[PDB]
Amino acid sequence: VSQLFQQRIVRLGGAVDDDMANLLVAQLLYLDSVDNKRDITMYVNSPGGSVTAGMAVFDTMRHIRPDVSTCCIGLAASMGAFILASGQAGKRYSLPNSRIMIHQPLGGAQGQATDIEIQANEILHHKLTLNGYLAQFTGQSMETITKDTDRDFFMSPQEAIEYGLVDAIISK
Amino acid sequence: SKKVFMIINSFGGSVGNGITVHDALQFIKAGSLTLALGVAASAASLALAGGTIGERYVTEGCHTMIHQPEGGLNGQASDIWIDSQEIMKIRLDVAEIYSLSTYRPRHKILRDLDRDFYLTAMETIYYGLADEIATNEVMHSIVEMTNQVWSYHDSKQERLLESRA
Amino acid sequence: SKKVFMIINSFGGSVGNGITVHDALQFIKAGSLTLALGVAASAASLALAGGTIGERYVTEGCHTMIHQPEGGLNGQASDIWIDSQEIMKIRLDVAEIYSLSTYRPRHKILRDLDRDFYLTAMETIYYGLADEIATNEVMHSIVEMTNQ
Amino acid sequence: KKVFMIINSFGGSVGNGITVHDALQFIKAGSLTLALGVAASAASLALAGGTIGERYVTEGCHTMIHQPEGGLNGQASDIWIDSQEIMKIRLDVAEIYSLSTYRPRHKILRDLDRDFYLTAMETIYYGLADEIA
Amino acid sequence: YPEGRPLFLPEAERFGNPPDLPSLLLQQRVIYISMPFLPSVTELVVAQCYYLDFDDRNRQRPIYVYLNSTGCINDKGQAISADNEFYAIWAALGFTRAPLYTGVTWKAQNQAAVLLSAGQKGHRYSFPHAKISTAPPVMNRVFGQAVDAQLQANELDYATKYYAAILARSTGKDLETCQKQYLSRKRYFSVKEAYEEGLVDKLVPGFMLNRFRKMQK
Amino acid sequence: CRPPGQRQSEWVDLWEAYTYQKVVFIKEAITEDVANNMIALTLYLDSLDQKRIYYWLNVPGGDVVPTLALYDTMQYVRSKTATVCYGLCLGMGGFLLTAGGEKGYRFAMPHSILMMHHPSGASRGQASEMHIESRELVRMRDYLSLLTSNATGQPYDRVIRELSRNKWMDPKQAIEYGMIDKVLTTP
Amino acid sequence: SPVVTPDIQIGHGEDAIEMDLYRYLLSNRIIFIGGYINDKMATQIVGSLMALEAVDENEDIRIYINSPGGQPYSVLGVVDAMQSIKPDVQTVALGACYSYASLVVAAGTKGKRYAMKNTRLMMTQPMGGSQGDIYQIKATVEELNALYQIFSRYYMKFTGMNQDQIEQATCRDHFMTPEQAKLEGLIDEIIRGKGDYTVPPAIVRQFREVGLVDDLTPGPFLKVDCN
Amino acid sequence: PFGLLLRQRIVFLGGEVEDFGADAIISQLLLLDSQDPTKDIKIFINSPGGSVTAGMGIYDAMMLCRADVNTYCFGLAASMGAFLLGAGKRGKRNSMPNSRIMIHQPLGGASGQAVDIEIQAKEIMYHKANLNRIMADYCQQPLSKIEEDTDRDRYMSPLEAKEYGLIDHIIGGEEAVFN
Amino acid sequence: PFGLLLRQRIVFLGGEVEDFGADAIISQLLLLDSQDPTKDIKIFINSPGGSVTAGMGIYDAMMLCRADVNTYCFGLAASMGAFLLGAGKRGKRNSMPNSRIMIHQPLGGASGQAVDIEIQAKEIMYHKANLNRIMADYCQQPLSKIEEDTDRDRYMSPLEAKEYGLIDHIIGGE
């Protein structure tokens, strides 16, 4: 898997947690430092993950002074699809038979009754942060993003272009 | 007499066990009084509505809850479609009993079964799951109602202890 | 109470327990009537053959499964040679019971005992493990004789 | 009137043997102790705690005599306090046996060093029993 | 030395009520099955019909059988028991001269469902919100050779032939019709369309809705 | 103790035969479930008659909170009590020896193993609630030492220094320390 | 090895260090089969067979087999790939063979099937398990009959025996000595030591079946009358 | 070893198909297409199953390859490898003469909310509908006949796989195939 | 990966702060000051918390070096990285606009005697009073409001963290 590092390809595989997010931004610090003109293509394949782990890789891609390219491989369930929509307009690619799922992220509330209400406000703040940023990436209204994110909704790659998740597909 | 007095206290349980104790209280010839205490889950709210209309009471501390049918599914692709349609039949079943007993249309109840939501004592009388608020005053009537129906069997018990002595 | 009635409905167990129930039914002076329900395993068919010949009843849904007993344990080299001669002697011991009660030859019992052999209600009467097909009348006389 | 019990034990703590020892001398009447099979350290305290002249033993019975055992773990200070506990318990059960066997106490601590087993013959010579049943 | 004769309802009414809840149901000739078909629970139901046919005076009162179990197949799909245990149930229940009134509370999974239609015709009682399922049975974990899988295929061959013979006598269909309709796939049945199919006939006796009682008042 | 006995004409269990004879037996450790049966037994014998209650202990240790439930019922009742020791009382079981019967009613066998130590506890979580449970364990430590100082006549400053570490007593030292009253003889 | 197995290799040179033991033996056209034959190591033996195919098309690829069994489809994929290559394959049997490793040593070319003196060979019908409904029970017996019919005509091509001798041998658990497997046609040459001609007890039972040795004259063989 | 077959443009698909094992084959498939878009790529499929999400990425990777692909089936092909067997170029599909082919629908578990069950119930039906219409293109078979053969959980010998349209050629001259 | 940026003084506090995990951070911190004491050392923060004595070991080791210290927070910092976020000097404490800042008091542990409970009680009472003196230094906040902020759990946005004194700048401006 070391041959992809010289071709400026990073791999987003499995559920995103703290040690994977530290390794993923470490590869992003090196690929922009060797060249600030060529893009970085990322193969996203994730079934979900933590709330703060997906937000730790979202902001560092916006700091890359050249654009990036995101290609869906197989499936992105409620955490990888947010990484797809945060890419550059005109560089969001996907497989023709892939799958895009948009859902609110998982997360628990362990502690006191005063503690579980003050930490659920952060989850309600995470829902306004995720749906607030996703509405600016797809160009749709604020109501339609908060309407379908409560339950799991799978999206075909053909209907993902008209909705605004991806920009094009690689058929060849 | 022939009255049946059941107490309602359950925070969980399967949805199918609540429908069995519902129709077990329907085919009784005499009346039935249901008193809800603590909570009313999906198995307990069907037992609360199974009583005779006019004798259903919910305390201020009790909280009625409407829950979707939870189930465990495992099989092939042909077997995963037939049992998931049964969940649509159970959701049609618990919305039917909630419609015929609470004077409510089926469309407004089915807009409540997609998400779990807890109810209070004031929303229980407004929806129609109960009839009166079980305050401290009407609770004294429940004490005197269960005293006459138990002394009707205890009067025969008092005659058997005196005959044995 | 000159006759006893024991309903046989079990999946069977060890072969040593099936020997004791067969030897005890052929020892008492009173009659022994055996009726099977469901199946008759290796520990249960010895109680089926342990009854007296003439009053062994099986129903239409009744089956019969005959097989050689399992066992074995871990040990030294010569310790396995001792118990393997015992399992071969127990397998010949249950073959003597099936050849005496059903009047079958000894070489044909071990051929059916080599594999898991299942029997229906029809071929159990033809083999010799039972006597006739049970019905309502063969057990209506059972429940009325035990009342006095 | 006279208590009659069967002694049969192969294990157990010796602290429970002191509870059944003092309970036998609490009875005003005599006691008949008849040991069968195995007699452990908790069982030999009830065997020696009976009345002198009525302690029976069979031909195949044996008596296990050994020091107390315990499990110690924790801070450094309470190990030293509990080290004197197991020492004086071993000195307590030596004085329990010394009231019946009429032997000097320094020879019993040498037999209490390791595990000590007795057959039916030398049990009478060591004073744990009286005669053979 | 005296004989321990049993007492029945024309004789034991002076000895008081039974203390435990299964003994009230045994005096009322009602068998309530709330447990799946385990080897522990099948021994009591054989002794129950043996007790009802022991010293009954009239021997003509209908026996009420209330079933609520998974049969031998659990919700996950594996076999917690085998299909041969049901053959001891129907041979012992149908022995008595009394008619068999069968009822269902909630569920009947592929072994209790064929016993539901096996009762007396014209009195199949059922709750109006129960679930009925007829599927072909499965076998437990068997590790054998090629000829060992053939003899296990013959055991399930006799299972579909015996279960369709009960449904042909109840619903009034052919032998191959009940194998194609019921014993092919894992399907489910409601209460309303099972009356048109022929599984049940009526509801429980004395059933009345609490809202329909308010309409009378 | 599994075979039962008789009271006057019928079969009754051995621990319940001494309950009618006003003798209480404690053989297992002091836990939350067995302490609910002991403090319900003290109120039952107090309602019937007013005589001296006998407690035979075999406690090898236990918790702190259910032991204080049995200690407070000794002073609440209007009857008298007497604690007699056979076997061993370790941990909080040795504190119940000095519960009542201070006026010459604390008996013990000559080979009883006694044990006195400070109580313990464990509760983790937030650092702010760790200060509150530390105040509860401190207030339980000195209060348990104040009751042993008044019952045995020992000074309060000596119980804090000695019972903080491991301390074991034989019945020869239990007389001079005021922990027991008399020693049981052979009859 | 109960706790750990160290890397038993040797690489030594005057200037550079060489590879480990299994990499050096693979370069000399020698393949080792060890452990359970699952789907993971099945691609290792087939993939090394395709690696040495592109190096040379005429040299004899040697495969060393030492396995107590394996998956029935994973051991099926190594036989038909071994028969669909250009050069001949010299098979050497190591340790024991339990109903799947005895097939790959019999699948070698004629005249190159070499077995050792104390090798254990075994041939049986394939096993399996029943699963669920009767539509899968009938699929299971049709699968076990398909695996039995494929493995039946494998031994007919490599040994040249009759189908009645295979059904009488694979009915129960039959363990074969290489002296007995040489008569059956599974192997081609017996490997012995420096004049090692000891008689195994399977041939002493075979000599008792034909009437060459009795209890009175046991000969210079081991004792067998202790049954 | 495996690196000797990589420079000769031959990859291996062995073991159970997982998400970690999916992108390892996709990353090396695009490297061979960028090096030489004219030379064919030979694959070897030996899989006893896999997920329907990661298995479709291998099918889209072979459709993304501009060069022709060659398939080889050895060992097992159970419900995922048989779909990747026929998905290659027609006329260049070979296999072993005794390898087994299993055409069956994928599996899946469902749990959770009542609205959550009906989403994944029609999702695995849409996966069943998409896998049937894709496999019916290169087989030259009608849709009603190919949708009922995948319901039967019975393996397929390579003798009847040739006229079925799933495979083109058999290595061995088509006489070594045993029934 | 991590070794390709370790030569330019890049420290990643990934994962939970344990006895072995924090020791790898301390042992690499002494390497960077010994080779060059004039250039700055960058420390990245992405950790959901950790131990009390181990997480304190990163703060005093960063104060041991004589060079400059830059600290950046990625994702979530829960009472161990958030205390280490403001541990650097003023002016070079930058943070991401979407990173969560969690303020929480540390935990404790005791198992033995009741006199061993009060030893660990005053041991964590000393650690609570220690960090309130440190956190009030680089934030210019009084001790009255900084003790109640550590009482309850509070997830803080970097918009209000700039005026609180914990961070200094925001990367990106918005």
Side-chain angles (χ1 to χ4, degrees), chain I residues 41 43 58-59 62-63 67-72 81-94 134 137-139 165-168:
Chain I
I41 294 96
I43 294 98
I58 299 100
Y59 157 72
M62 281 160 64
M63 295 298 301
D68 264 349
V69 163
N70 316 135
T71 312
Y72 303 96
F83 175 68
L84 261 298
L85 175 61
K89 69 182 293 294
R90 201 171 321 275
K92 269 84 176 175
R93 297 180 301 178
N94 313 336
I134 299 302
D137 281 358
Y138 44 77
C139 289
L166 193 55
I167 67 176
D168 297 333

Side-chain angles (χ1 to χ4, degrees), chain H residues 16-45:
Chain H
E16 183 62 11
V17 178
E18 299 263 26
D19 51 337
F20 183 71
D23 52 13
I25 319 291
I26 307 161
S27 45
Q28 65 189 2
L29 265 178
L30 54 94
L31 282 177
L32 299 179
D33 197 278
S34 45
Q35 280 175 0
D36 204 6
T38 307
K39 187 66 172 65
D40 55 326
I41 295 100
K42 299 180 177 299
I43 69 176
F44 281 79
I45 309 175

Side-chain angles (χ1 to χ4, degrees), chain G residues 139 143, chain H residues 47-49 73 76-85 99-105 135 149-157 166:
Chain G
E143 190 64 35
Chain H
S47 158
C73 169
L76 203 45
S79 281
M80 301 303 305
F83 168 65
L84 269 302
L85 186 57
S99 45
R100 307 299 295 180
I101 294 96
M102 174 78 252
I103 307 177
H104 194 255
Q105 67 265 4
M135 84 195 315
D149 203 58
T150 186
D151 193 273
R152 309 278 94 89
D153 212 341
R154 42 167 299 271
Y155 279 72
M156 182 180 300
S157 279
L166 189 58

